[model samples]
Target chain A: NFCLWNLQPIQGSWMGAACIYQMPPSVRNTWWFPLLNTIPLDQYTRIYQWFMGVDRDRSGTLEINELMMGQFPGGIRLSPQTALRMMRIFDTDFNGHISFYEFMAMYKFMELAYNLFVMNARARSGTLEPHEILPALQQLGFYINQRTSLLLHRLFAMAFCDLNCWIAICAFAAQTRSAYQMIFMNPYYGPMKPFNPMEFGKFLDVVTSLLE
Target chain B: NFCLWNLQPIQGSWMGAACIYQMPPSVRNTWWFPLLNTIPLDQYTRIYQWFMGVDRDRSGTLEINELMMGQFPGGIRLSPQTALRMMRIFDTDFNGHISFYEFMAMYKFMELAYNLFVMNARARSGTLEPHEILPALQQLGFYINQRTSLLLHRLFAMAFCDLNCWIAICAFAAQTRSAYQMIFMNPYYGPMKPFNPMEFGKFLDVVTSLLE
Candidate 1:
């Protein structure tokens, strides 16, 4: 059973105070730095403290079930497959669970997804059109023009149960791709071979179906 | 000359993006973490980016004159002796410059001092009464009673040129004392030797006088 307690009040971010040191050096120095900078310190502290609370086994990591419990609280339904895929998107080492670093990435991508969703739909609750994708991406710092944004949105949307899920997946894919570009810094390599969209679509389908 | 230009826009904190990795190993694991948690990432990013801008010599450190220029901007005046002690409080290594780590601590303690001042005076423009000190310290997570807070306030105010400077010095001293306690966890060791407040007063007077 997980223990819940009124944690001592801290005037600063809990993540900075308690968790940053625990981050492994490899991630701390690279992609994680980008993710770390993206979120506010107090926000990090709040979300991470929530993570610590639901970590029932005290294993210092989170599983799909734990996430469902944390995100959905009571009686809200989320499919097991959908939940697992959501976890998988961030499970960098593919160990079938989320680490602290992965959790930070997940939080960031989720926020990005919501922001993009609002920009695209002009409201919090609707779907985005292919044309709307370019402006949305531009505002979020993805500089692909009308053609590329439309093409990616078409492919990305095939996996969606709704626009929110599609946007979240899109955000994750964009960040991962950006990280690869930063790491390689290659001009001569040309574009990497595109993975089959249908295959990727099915993977996304399972993840988004949880919201249904 | 320190170069000022339009740096790349980062959606996240510059501190988290570039600087946290550079923090020293020892400090990273301890008091620095508390300071880290206290600030917002965007705020950290903004402040550190400003720091980098003024670090014209590219020494990855800041001198008092650099701070004078950064904080005072155009025509504002600050005394050199006063500025040096402000640097001294956070300059744990006793060096004449502020490292990034020390800078983070300085920012945090300064914010803490400001908050305490406002709480004590009920307005941003005035000084604190010795009786007004207890509630302010309590809100700030210091548990010392009326008598002790009164004692500390009287001694602290002796060194201040104004209420703001007095409060800032109080915050720094409290944090340092707390860090010592955390390190030792001692009960039988009794209190540490009292350094002469007059000496401490002169040190603070020089620092606070810069604000004049």
Candidate 2:
């Protein structure tokens, strides 16, 4: 269904670039902006930094084998096969491994997508609603799928083992959604949209408890 | 000439909102985040510290007048009329005041233009020459005139005072032209046309600059 207009081999890379563009300049300027402000910065940084560090036998760049070495730090160690699968989702060129440019492009796209998701969620609810959380994830999934659908699914399967995947995805959705709500929605620029299931549950609980 | 595109009248008092969108998210968040973060712990307390100060009328909305009312702890001073006029150049709507949205859009546009100018300057210099700056500026001004010819002269007049108008215009051109350099000369992208002074500049500078 994806065509040249909606999808490009470089779309993955371009999305990555756009993410950097969308990042709130303040947060972007600070080294800890990603961690202190939103997601645990150290956690995300650790993964990318490891990937870069392990590419030490550097032909001035990383290959698939080199990236697998960095998986230990993320706690849930993945097999080389799993790492290779994950890399394919981002590489876009069908290359076995991702280059620094590819990695940066993917990183930028994720950041942009995250910001847009948060902004959208905030516009909807005075806080990021629970229901709103899943859509953002789904959107990211779709964006990845547009580039390499099979690779995305395989990577997801490898990274998120069955029960853990569901739980982690839910948690991920909840935290990101809440961050958006806390940061963007509190000021309340205009009328907010209704909260979705996740947001409604959390928002209701917070509002009800506050009222009580 | 300016009537080619529809110009709608904006509603509400064009005070703070005029420049709200123009201000970067970083600036907006930083400007207000600290104050909002400091709401007193005791909600039931009759007296509380006002970070932005209390709006005497409690309009639930803050206006420029209120903003200047020591709400920021320090009294706000007005920008000099010349500075204000300079800013009004990007206030395309001619609302007498600039909004954050407009400011951001203008800023981003300038950023793109500046990058292009730098790239072209580098190419002309071969090893990064400085003399190419004027030509880059002239090129950028010509390009901007094409995109925004309708409002070009009026906005330019507003931005540059009579004395410095020519220099200011050139400066703007230099910045914008630099940004274009990236897109135009890069082999990855298709080649862009060279700047045509006769078609783009319209002899505005030669006539206007010599007026004094």
Candidate 3:
């Protein structure tokens, strides 16, 4: 139930234009940028237009189920199973709906993630060179290592299921411990604590089990 | 210009077993891991044994480039251009080689970025609903935005690009009538500023010509 009085169209707005202009040159040069260029200007307008078509509930914000009642009606549909899986992934606090901030964060992370994956795949396929693989690996390794280092110091602050932190810390810690044990331990499995206890537990329980 | 003595074999050292064990789970799960795993424990008695085939430079530290050299020597020989480009992307700072810190950073960023991208793509494709996109976006956005915002603020400070003072002062001054009208009447047209008396004389001559 969006109110007409409160809704401001974003087209020609200074702040809106500034936001669009501030996108990195790399993104602007991408093919998708031109295609998505109308979004910033049209988002508010589109939302207003969408509201006129629906809003039987008269709520200021559109309800999750109510979003489907627009011109772009049913262009997207999620099966119950898929929706459940998705909810699990997005709902960090296990809250049913996603907040605006959460939605934006997820989208940005996804964009970066896809780019990296594609780049890595290309590298693996020989479309990218062996030397190319190194720098990316180094950069990626450094990024992971740094984050893990920070996470290690702030382990208590992290949520239990923050897989990214867990994977990174685990990988780094495992490598470090493995390296140390081989040099220091007389027995191969001798007394080195695994890099990240939480991750190691998961790795042992999940990955090891699958392999076995 | 490579030295053979600098490249000691990993046999007969504890670090050998350690190095093999230190391989990340992703690599370890690959087909190659099992084969590597099959190598007799005694074969990796020394640290050099684990690295003997992989260490291109015989450098003690396991730099990302060295690891790549070990993994794809043939590709390096065939496609130097692609390799160089890949390296540049990961190198981040355009350094010739990748250190461990750089490597880990690149890795973590890659994993996080890849996961986020896939999730967003799923959401865009309708495989994930708005609720799905919202949560993931929020988590990623909050973290990255906070970091980048801080970084940008620091960069602006260092560059003396703070807009709160000099630019603001200038903007206020430019809004005044006396200063504004004076500039309009005496628009400077070249690299050199005209002397006030001479410029006024030229303006008068131009006006006389126009009248004639």
Candidate 4:
């Protein structure tokens, strides 16, 4: 998402969407969760700070132009299409913008996706086997050894597994069931068969709860 | 969800000795074209070459012991548990032993699986949200944030009846528990405001029609 050393600047202020992608290495708290509670607070700070700072309009959400922070076709930026892509998960209410918590949800969702990708990769040779999966989580930096390291990587593979989806499923089990069924039923994402955060959130409440 | 360049596993060289879990780097793809693609090819060759070179018994496959090599004690090559996972994938026939063909098949599966994985990840990513905001007052205590990540640790770390903290929990529980409990039962409040990991994980469902 960012280059390690791409902050070329001619003035005092550091520049670029480079900030959107990385946190400095010195952050001691950089970590993950479910393993050792290492959910990377440092990166979160960097991301939150970046997102808020780039919300130049200060309308409580970020627009593509703000996230871009540069000319239309510049060297360093979140392109319009990419911005729209990000808004898909973060933009609740079908609005063009995502609130602050929505930004955090987007980050958390990315991590979930990262975890799922490898777990799915591990399961791919015809079927998913336990012995194969335990290590996959550890490979992604989870604490697991013999006692069946877990988090339902396969279901998680199909699941958005974002915080909202997780919370929603737990809070409204009977209600979320139909939503999960819908995920399996949908052919839109086709091979992926993913869920919508908006729907999942609403299943729990009339408003978007996780991104608030 | 991952930077494509994350496959650059080692220092100075583009192959093994470093893993993503250890890299502190990042995911992405598109470099995979096969033997002509050369990315996984080099990795496959390097790993397979290392495997055979380590096969001390000349059995054409590694025994779990053969996979776990290093200095007598502290210096580790692979954890016995982890090696089990790798071997499980390579032991395609469930025969406890991996053959050369199984080794080749593993790479083949990786490539094909990766292609599918990338596509699904892309699609899963395309889905959007309906989104969050208030506690009216004290309810915000349950929301996840920088300080909140440490809440569980601190709670458990606290000695029994630790001053205002424990009293505080009691104080609040006696007074405020009903508010959240009302939420727990209200069915309209929704999830996502769990003060800790366990709370945020409840199931709930609604809105967006939850399509396929």
**lDDT score, candidate 2, position B12:** 31
lDDT of each: 0.53, 0.37, 0.34, 0.37
lDDT of 2 by residue, B1-212 (tens): 36759764444337546554664564343212222222233621322334224445554433334323422112222223323322433333444443433333333433444454446544432222233434444454453233233233343444222322322344333333332332224343334455454433432332222111
Per-prediction DockQ comes to 0.01, 0.01, 0.01, 0.02
User: In model 1, what is the error at residue B52, expressed in angstroms?
Assistant: 5.2
Candidate 1 local Cα displacement, residue B67, angstroms: 5.1
- Candidate 1: where are CA atoms >4 Å away? A1-212, B1-22, B49-58, B64-89, B92-95, B158-161, B178-212
Q: Distance (Å) between predicted and true CA of A165, model 2?
A: 4.4
Better of 1 and 2 by TM-score: 1
**Of the true interface contacts, what fraction does each candidate have?**
0.00, 0.00, 0.00, 0.03
What's the lDDT of the predicted structure labeled candidate 4?
Answer: 0.37
| Docking class of predicted structure 2 | incorrect
Write one digit per residue (lDDT tens) for candidate 2, span A61-110: 56667655653321333355444433533444444656554544434534
**In terms of docking quality, how is candidate 4 classified?**
incorrect
Q: What would the per-residue lDDT of candidate 1 be over residues B67-162, giving only the tens digit for each residue?
A: 666652122233453355456455556568888767777667666666667667753346676677667766665555555555566545652225
- Could you say which candidate leads in TM-score? 1
Assess every candidate by TM-score: 0.33, 0.20, 0.19, 0.21
Candidate 1, residue A52: Cα displacement in angstroms equals 69
Greater TM-score among 1 and 4 belongs to 1
